[PDB]
Structures are given as structure tokens and as C-alpha cells.
Design a protein around this nucleic acid. Sequence first.
RNA 1: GGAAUACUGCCAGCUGGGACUGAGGACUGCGACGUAAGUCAAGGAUGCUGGCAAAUGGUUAUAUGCCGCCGUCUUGAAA
RNA 2: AAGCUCGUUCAGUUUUAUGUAAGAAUGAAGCUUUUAGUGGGCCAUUUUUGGGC
RNA 3: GCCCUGGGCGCUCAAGCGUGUUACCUAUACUCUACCGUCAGGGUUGAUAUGCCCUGACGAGUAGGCAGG
Lengths: 222, 126, 163, 118, 140, 106
Amino acid sequence: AEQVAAERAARKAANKEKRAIILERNAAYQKEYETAERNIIQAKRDAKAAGSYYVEAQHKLVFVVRIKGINKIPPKPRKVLQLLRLTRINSGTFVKVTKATLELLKLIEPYVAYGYPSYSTIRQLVYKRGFGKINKQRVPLSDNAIIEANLGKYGILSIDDLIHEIITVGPHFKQANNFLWPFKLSNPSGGWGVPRKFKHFIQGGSFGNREEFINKLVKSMN
Amino acid sequence: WRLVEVGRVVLIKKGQSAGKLAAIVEIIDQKKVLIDGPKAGVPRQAINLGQVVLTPLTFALPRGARTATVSKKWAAAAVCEKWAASSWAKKIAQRERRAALTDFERFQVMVLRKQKRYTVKKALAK
Amino acid sequence: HFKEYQVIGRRLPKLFRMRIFASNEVIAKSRYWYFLQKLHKVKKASGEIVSINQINEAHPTKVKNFGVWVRYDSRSGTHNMYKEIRDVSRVAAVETLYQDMAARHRARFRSIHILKVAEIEKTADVKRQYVKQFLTKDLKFPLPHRVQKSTKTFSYKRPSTFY
Amino acid sequence: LPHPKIVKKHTKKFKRHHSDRYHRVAENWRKQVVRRRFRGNISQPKIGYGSNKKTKFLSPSGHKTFLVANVKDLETLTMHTKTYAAEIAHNISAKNRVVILARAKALGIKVTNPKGRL
Amino acid sequence: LKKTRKAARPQKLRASLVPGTVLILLAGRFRGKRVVYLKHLEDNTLLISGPFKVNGVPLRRVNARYVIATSTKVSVEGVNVEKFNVEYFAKEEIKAERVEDQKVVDKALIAEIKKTPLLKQYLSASFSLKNGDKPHMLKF
Amino acid sequence: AESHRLYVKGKHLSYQRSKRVNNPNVSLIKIEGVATPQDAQFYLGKRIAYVYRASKEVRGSKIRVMWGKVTRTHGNSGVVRATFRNNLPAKTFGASVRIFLYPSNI
RNA sequence: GGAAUACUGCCAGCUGGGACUGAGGACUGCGACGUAAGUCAAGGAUGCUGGCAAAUGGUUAUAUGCCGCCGUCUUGAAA
RNA sequence: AAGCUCGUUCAGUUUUAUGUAAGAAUGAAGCUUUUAGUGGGCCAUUUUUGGGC
RNA sequence: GCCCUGGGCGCUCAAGCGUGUUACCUAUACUCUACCGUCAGGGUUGAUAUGCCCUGACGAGUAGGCAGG
């Protein structure tokens, strides 16, 4: 029959059109990121030159990783971790920054480490350990069609779209975070560094808010 | 008896500047001193005595001399020529060359050693 | 390896300013917040850190007899202490003071407060003999009983400690 | 050929705990420190030792052993000669063993235990 | 069997192996002998010559991973090695061609070897280790 | 030449282990002259051969040899981990070993 | 006045050394190369070569490196 | 375990209301009915009791 | 700050003490992969079946309960 070639040609044309759409979207996202970083740097330069202090915006995205085992965990932190999908050790997920969540991290802070990720780390995680949740099953993200089918209605049709939504904390942050399976992370390649892991980071420990150092820690744990 | 003093030339034992020559410009304390070596390219920085070995050579240097003054005094003193004539520098160069010898170069060295040994043995007793 | 940072705050004004020495900006912010409670009554949620910037030595190529005023919380209260240290930079001078305190008084980063650091450009101003001895004219002294790290397990020459 | 490495997982056959010390205790495995799987003690058989489906029951020669005691049983393997090998029961007399071996050779079926009582 | 997607990409030789380079064999009857590289064969072996007239090592196929490279090089442009091929070593006692071809090959290389002083005797001497040797430090 | 050696000599210390647990699947081999892991990096992937003599004449000779390989460095003293298709007997603790120069890359 | 350099972070930059893994089983799927045929590192290893009539390996004894009497009992897991 | 039927309803999870209409965040149901067993003390902790316990 | 009165060998510019900086040792912990099983989802017959399969997760445990040999 003539279907064998006709269907192949039609699907190839549709895939080519979708590829061009994704390419233009990715180019726009990259241009937006570059412009935002350049504008931030220019604003800092202007503040420094004008003899006035800078008013950096609050960190709207944080990442939390489980650092302690299940044993002897008090019930409240254990429930917090369970509701945060931080069940097994060395696992983490992105969470929106709010007082409702900051006060939650305050309780699990002794048993978790968190900070402010970056575009490079988020992209690396999504590309390597990025696993999607479909029909309650764990499906690795390897094709743009897989993500598009589950989040097409939300305007997400590629891995780059998912990364852009996650980093920008856009309107569909809830759905993007839920679709992503909790990240399975190995122990750091270079080790935790400090001789005693179970201590506050600000006093030579590990657990606690470390801001940019979380990006370095994740890459070693990736 | 080698003594630490301003203008004393030293050899760095470990670090990116290991194997290069520097001079003590100003002593900081019992264990740390300030050294420089513009000719060798080592940046002006402080170093501990444990990481540096004092050479027997010495030259006059103004206290707290800057990089330009240190370089000018080093060039004027020509301490580099004295260092090369020292047996220590000769041994260092010999070790470097010997480690850099190729297999064919080593075979030629063995042949020359046998040739020299023949004559040396013939020279004995006589 | 410490680092010098300038941290200011105003509880969202007077713009309280002080110098904080820490290995990273995160520790510097925590130390600034802790010192805020001692200086006055302020909380972290009250405002925000207006600006934090690392301060580099103007010229890390000159030996300076740093005069440092340090207050530490000993096992029986806190006492004001003053010391002079000969070094090339403030970052190294404060680290040396911290190490000396930990070696003797066993005071560490947790219970040490840095008040002021200032250079001394005139002789006879340093009242500490251990620094005063190094302020004389170009001197010379030996390094007896020097040793060498013998990588080889065995030695055949009976090494000597001469320098 | 389709005879990949067959990993036995645990070649050593399990033995009943303390059976060596006491004669009356048989070597047949039976459940009860062993129950607590203490360090340095015999391992307990469990679901971890399950053999792969694609290689279960396969002999090292890569063929299943099928017991045969009549001409019809041997002929039944004519379709499955590629996978099933013949095996003569110990109760078969030598008189029928010759016929069974001849039929197996003529139909290409390998005999796992030839030369029996011959 | 599924259509395995594994193309037979041509072998890539390390930059330390160049025609006319002096090779050292670590395995085989000629282990420790010095040999001269000539041509790379389609079978991923290295065509080498002693030469036979100098150290007795004939033309043989060898594996690169068992050969230590050396900086010493000699001219090998005048030797027509195109005649030799993988089929030249098949067997399915010395063959007559094995002598004449070896002599012809060595005739176009003995002069080059003699051009460099002490190179003939250097090749005639088998390489061997000695007490205190540190191959990792040595450049070979 | 009097010396025909073509392999770097060494010694066998003990298998990879803990305070009370030892895994014979990995053997710690010490190479003479090596001092730091950086130097030992060159010996990675080199075949390790152990030679011992037996009264009985085996199929090929009176000599029996085990064919192993190098895996990775170990410790700060330059020790390198060695793995063999058949683990060496524990009686050879402290015995010498042969480390060949192939496969090579220099 | 000028660069340089330490440090931080990025490279959908390059180039190697070493360790384990070969799991699926005629093509259907997403991609790159190409003007087209076709090729590809693209939903899981292929190509070549050498040694072999005891080959590889199994049970067992003995010696080496490390580890280590039973069921019921009070019930605080216990002697 | 045993029927229904709602796919959503729930939480040892976290702040403003004055304990909540929460179109605040995060994670991801209910009534039944009969059916085996279940009557311990203790390590640390909490409330922080007095003169050893 | 430390001393005096108040695991074995040994260690004394420690191989003792406090602290700072790198590397290394390895749990059944963690990360990648091979296999058994349970649990969950799905393809299946104009015949390919209490079967042939694809995908994911999970694997401690006395009494007790259920299932399969």
C-alpha cells in the first residue's frame, strides 16, 4: 500500500516543523538568559559607579538534598521530607522559595543541605538524571515528544522548555516539578571535604544553606 | 655557616617555582621570610624556611627593595654566573641531562664509558 | 585561608558597618548577623544585608607590623586583648592570630571577635618584644639542625643536619 | 550458538546448620545465630539466588534433559530436537537401551547418559 | 540477530609510531631486540625489519601495544614495502621468497643504518633493563 | 647482556580489606621505585605475572604462571591495586611479582 | 596610564591513560551527515587473530590471609 | 480480609487573619464488617520534686 | 594554654594537645549495570491466552495471616 511512505513523510514533516519550533524557542531562551545576566551586571556596575549599594533580588529558586539517613529521624522532619519527596538519602528536588517553604527547610535543615542552583547545574541535572513521572511510572527524558505529550497543554514541548520553566519558576512550576521524578544523586566525587558531615556549613560542617556552593556540591554529587 | 639575611640567594625546593633561584628581601618572622626572583620569573611572595634551602652565595640588596630594584641588583651582582660554577648547580644540570638521556644516547654513553675504562685501566699500574 | 569582607546592615538608616573575616561570604554574613545582636537589638528577618564586598590588600608586597585588637570569650567571660603581629597582609595576620589563640588560649573562630587592625609605621611603637626584636637593622641568624625529607627508606651516608 | 555463559550464582550446595558436628542431623536444608544471618555464618537460601529464565534447567551442553522410556517418547522430541536431549531412565534394561540409542542417533537426539549397562 | 550498528572504523595509530622508527619488542622469541618500523598492515599489525642482516630478526608482523616507541628514526623512503601484504604471512621449512625478499629489503636499509654512527652496533645489541631502572621516568 | 629483565619487579602486600573484613578479589601490589600515585599512573593496565615452581610437571613445563592485570592506584605511597582471573594464595603475602611493560603507549 | 596574573563560574571546547559492563536479538521509533543514492558514535558488540586431547572447570584433603554448641525459659534484648 | 462508590479526598507537613471563608505552598479518600495475635520493662528525654534518694 | 600533688608494641620538634589545609583507607550506605521474585500500569484472539510480552517500583523482621511448591 501507499501508507508506508505517506505516513513516514507526514510524520517526518511534522517532526521537522516541531524541531524548528523548538530551535527558535531555545534560541529565544538563550538570548533572554544572556540579556538578563548582562542587565544584572550592568545594574551592579551602575550601582557601584553611582556610590550607592545594590538591591539584589531575592532568590526565587532553591534546591534541597537529603544528607542524613532514615534512622533516628524525628517524626516531624521525616514527615516534612516525605511530603518534600526527599525519601531516600542523596535525593533532592526543586522547591519554590516562600515563607511557607523557608519555615519548612528550617525544620529539616539539620538533616538536609540546600542552596541556590544555576542554569548550568539545572541543565546538567535535567539532561543526565532527569526522569519524568508518567502514569505513575518512572520514564527517563530522552525524546522531546515524551515531554510534549505530558506537558503539551502547558506549552512545554522540549527538555529546554522544562529547564526554562524550572529555572524561571514560571506559572507552571508546580506541574514541572511534579512531573520530574526525585533526582537520584551519588555521593560527591571528591567527598564532603569537612571531616564531620553532621555539622552546620557555616561552622565547617555540611548541612545548611550554602547558596552558590550548592552548585559545586551537586556537580560533584552528579 | 649559611645565615639568613637581606640579599641572601636561595633555592626553592617545592612549588611551581621549585628549582628556581630567589633572594631574601625582608625577614617577616623566625619561620617566614619575603623572597623575590624577577630573573627566574617567580612572583614576589612570602615563603616559609621549610620550603626553601639557603645557598652559600650572597649579594648586597637594599632592605625592602622593590621588584625593579631587586632585578637591577641581581643583574649587577651576576650571581647567576657564580651559581652555575658551583658544584651544586653542576650536579643539578648533570642529573637533568642524565634523566633526559635517550636509549640510543644511553647506549652511546655505555660505549664511551667502556672506551674510557679501557684507557683508565691501562693507565694504572704503569 | 581566611578572606576579608565588608558587610553593612540597616534593618530595612544608620547603616551599621563593620569588617568581617571569613573563609566565604556565607560565613561572613552569619558572623555579621551574630555581631548585630551583640552591638544592638536586631534580627535576621528585620531587614537585609545592604551590601557585601570582599576587600583585597592594597599591596600584598610590603611587610607591615599590624596592630590588632581582639576580644575573645574565654571559659570565664570575655576579656579585651591587644596584640601586634608582623606580617604582609591583614588576611594572613588575622589567620596567624587565630592560630596562636587556638594554640594557647584554645580560642577559635566561634569565640573570637576582631575589633580593629592597623599598621604601625614607626619603630618603638610596638610594645611587644617578640615583634620588637625584628624591627632592628638588617640582622643575620642561622638555622641550626636542619633536616631533609628522605624519600628513600634507606640511607647509606649517615645524613648530617648542617645548614 | 545460543549457549551463553550460565552463571550458577551459588555453585556450593547448601548444607543444614551444624549437620557436620552431629551425625543424626541430615544434610537436607531446614530452617531453625543462623536465623540472624550473623557475619561468618552459612548463608540462607533466598529469592536472590533465582536462576535466569532463559537459562534455567539448561545443562552445560545447552540442552534440556528429558527422561525417555519408550520409542514414542523419544519420537515426541523430533520437533524439539534442537532444545531437548534424551535421557534413559536407570530402570531401562540394556535390551531396550540399544534400540533407544539407535532411534536417538537416527533422529539426531543427543543422549545425556549413553553407555548405560553396555 | 538484530542489525548491530557498529561500523569497522579504521585504526588510529598513536603519534609516537612513525615509519622508520626504532621499535623494541617486549614479547616473543625476539623480545628485547631492537627493530625498525616499516609499514602498517590492514590487519592492525606493524610491518617491521631487524634488519635481518644486522640482528637476525626477519620481517615480521607485530602488535603496537607490545612495542615501545623510541625517538631514534631512520630513513625508510627507499624501501618498496608495498609488495608485502597480509596474504604474505598465510600458511594454511623457510620459503624461498622469504630469503630473497628479506635480503632485498635489508639491502636498501643497511646503508641507511651505517650512515648513522654506532647505529648498526646499537641495533645489534639487545635491549634489557638494569638494576635501579625506572621506566616511567626514562624517556626511552 | 647479563640482565635479561624486561618487567618491573615488585612485592605483594595483602588483599583489599578493612579492619576485620578482607576481599581477596583485589590484591595490593607494591612496585619498586614507585613513591606516589602519579608515578604509578603509568603502570595502570600492565599485566602482572606471578611465577612459582611445583614438583609435578604441568602440561607445558615445570613452571606455572598466573595472568593478572592492573586496575588503579592505592594509597599515597604509590601502591597499585591488582586483579587476577584467579586470586593469589594468601601464603604469597610479601612475595615478589612480575609487572610487564605491555600493553604500552609511550 | 596600561595590561598581565591569583580566585570564582561557563564552555551544547579539544585531546588521552586505566577499571567493570556486551546486557536486547531479522526492519518498523527520535535524530545527525548528504544536492541524491545512501552513511552514521543515532531505542544494548562488532571485525580480525593465536593456543587446544587432555582443553576451561567441578568435589575432596591438607597449609596459608580474615571471620565464628544447641530448642524452652524470665522477658529489658540477660547472663 | 471483607460491598459500595467517590477520584478525587487526605496529612504527626510550614506563617497573616482570630484557630479560620484560605481562589497560600508541598505531597498524594470514605463508611463499614469480622479476624489471628496483642496486659514489658527499659536507654535517653520531658514536667524540671525535695534534700542522700 | 599544658604539667606536677590532685588495646598491645611503643611514642617525646609525638606516633601527646587545639585548630587550619589537601590526599588516602571502606558498610549490606550511596551512584551505573546483570539476574529471581513480589506489587502496579499497558499490548494481546477478523487467532498469536490459567498464555507470549513491554515499562516502573520494591526486597529487614518474632507471633500471626495469606500465597506457591
